[PDB]
């Protein structure tokens, strides 16, 4: 996951947008810089990476910064990204979301019901040098009655549950 | 020519407007008496050389110059720093 970034000086964002570029910024306790990326290339990436997976930004001085996304502001009308926030990581432990694996399908089928991925992902504290790929769930006996919430998870090394942990994650519910 | 029939409202009132508000601002010279604020509470609390009437009205106690002051949780004070 790599993206050619560029350095934004003070060119009206409008004009950059107009020209298929995507204005933005990068920051961390230490650096703060106006940047821009190209749209279609960023989307190609973000469409998978998103906020779950690191992106490496290639600036015009050859340097390659390891970053996470923290924000995608978008124009309600013409639902497109107006501006991207990039957080450049280092080594201090940083909070983020990590995707889940909804294995199989739930047993609530006779009453017409349908699964609700209330949490596709969960908030966790992690070091930048111990970032997991995913987390593994266990859905099978999720009937029209019962559900699951809290620290019912397979937490690997480097991970710290930064949620309640008492909070609903996926519930099967009646049809429309 | 068949005229439709209509009702009434039970609504059409408001009171006389009462011209509330600050009457002199920071850095207006004032004589003793000059009322400085017409208000419905302690929206401003009286400061140095500022009295307040039965109706919450703040007023200069001396011939001076007005200073305002926000003290957060203590509220807002109007003072008259005197010239002499």
């Amino acid at each position: 996951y790599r993206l050619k970034a560029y350095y934004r000086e003070g060119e009206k964002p409008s004009a950059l947008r107009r020209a298929g570029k995507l204005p933005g910024v990068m920051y961390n306790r230490h650096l703060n810089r106006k940047v821009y990326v190209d749209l279609v290339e960023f989307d190609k990436v973000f469409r998978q990476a998103s906020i779950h997976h690191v992106i490496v930004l290639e600036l015009p001085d050859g340097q390659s910064l390891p970053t996470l996304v923290r924000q995608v502001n978008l124009d309600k009308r013409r639902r497109r990204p107006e501006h991207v926030d990039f957080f450049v990581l280092s080594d201090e432990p940083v909070e983020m979301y990590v995707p889940l694996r909804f294995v199989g399908t739930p047993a609530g089928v006779r009453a017409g019901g349908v699964l609700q991925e209330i949490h596709r992902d969960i908030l966790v504290k992690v070091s930048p040098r111990n970032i997991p790929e995913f987390i593994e769930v266990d859905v099978s006996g999720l009937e029209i009655g019962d559900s699951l919430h809290a620290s019912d998870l397979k937490l690997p090394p480097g991970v710290e549950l930064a949620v309640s942990p008492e909070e609903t994650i996926a519930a099967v519910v009646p049809p429309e | 020519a068949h005229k439709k029939g209509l009702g009434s409202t039970r609504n059409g009132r408001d009171s006389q407007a009462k011209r509330l508000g600050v009457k002199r601002y920071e850095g207006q010279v004032v004589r003793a008496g000059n009322i400085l604020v017409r208000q419905r509470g302690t929206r401003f609390k009286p400061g140095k050389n500022v009295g307040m009437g039965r109706d919450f009205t703040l007023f200069a106690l001396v011939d001076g110059v007005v200073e305002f002051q926000d003290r957060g949780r203590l509220g807002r004070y109007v003072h008259v720093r005197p010239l002499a």
Partner: protein
């Protein structure tokens, strides 16, 4: 039919429709949206009609999420009457909708059924609609 249970006030002023949606603009629940492309007042009868068509299509099937709610009252003087004599009587209720509002949403369904269902609903609505997916609509960290 679809209205609040209480209101602070019974009648209220018409007002206006500045652009944008403010919020309710990204997906959030189901896996396919029906989005607004124009401002409008949408009436409860329309919402309902669309909703019913959705279900009727994937009969009793998946799930539906109605994301606009008619809180605004809709006045109208009696028929044939002249002007004045106070505001009119309340006839129904509307939901104020502005471009980029995700009005509906669906889950537990094939793209084929979904695509179609929504289209259908878009017909019952007195505005232009678009269909949506689940892109960078994941305002997280």
């Amino acid at each position: 039919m679809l209205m609040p249970r209480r209101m602070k006030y019974r009648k209220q002023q018409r007002g206006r429709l500045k652009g944008a949606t403010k919020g309710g603009d990204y997906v959030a629940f189901g896996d396919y949206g029906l989005v607004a492309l124009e401002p409008a007042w949408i009436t409860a009868q329309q919402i309902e009609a669309a909703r019913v068509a959705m279900v009727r299509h994937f009969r009793r099937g998946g799930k539906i999420f109605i994301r606009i709610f008619p809180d605004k009252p809709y006045t109208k003087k009696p028929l044939e009457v002249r002007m004045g004599k106070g505001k009119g009587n309340v006839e129904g209720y509307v939901a104020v909708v502005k471009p980029g509002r995700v009005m509906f949403e669906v889950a537990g369904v094939t793209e084929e059924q979904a695509m179609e269902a929504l289209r259908i609903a878009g017909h019952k609505l007195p505005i232009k609609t678009k269909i949506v997916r689940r892109d960078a609509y994941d305002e997280a960290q």
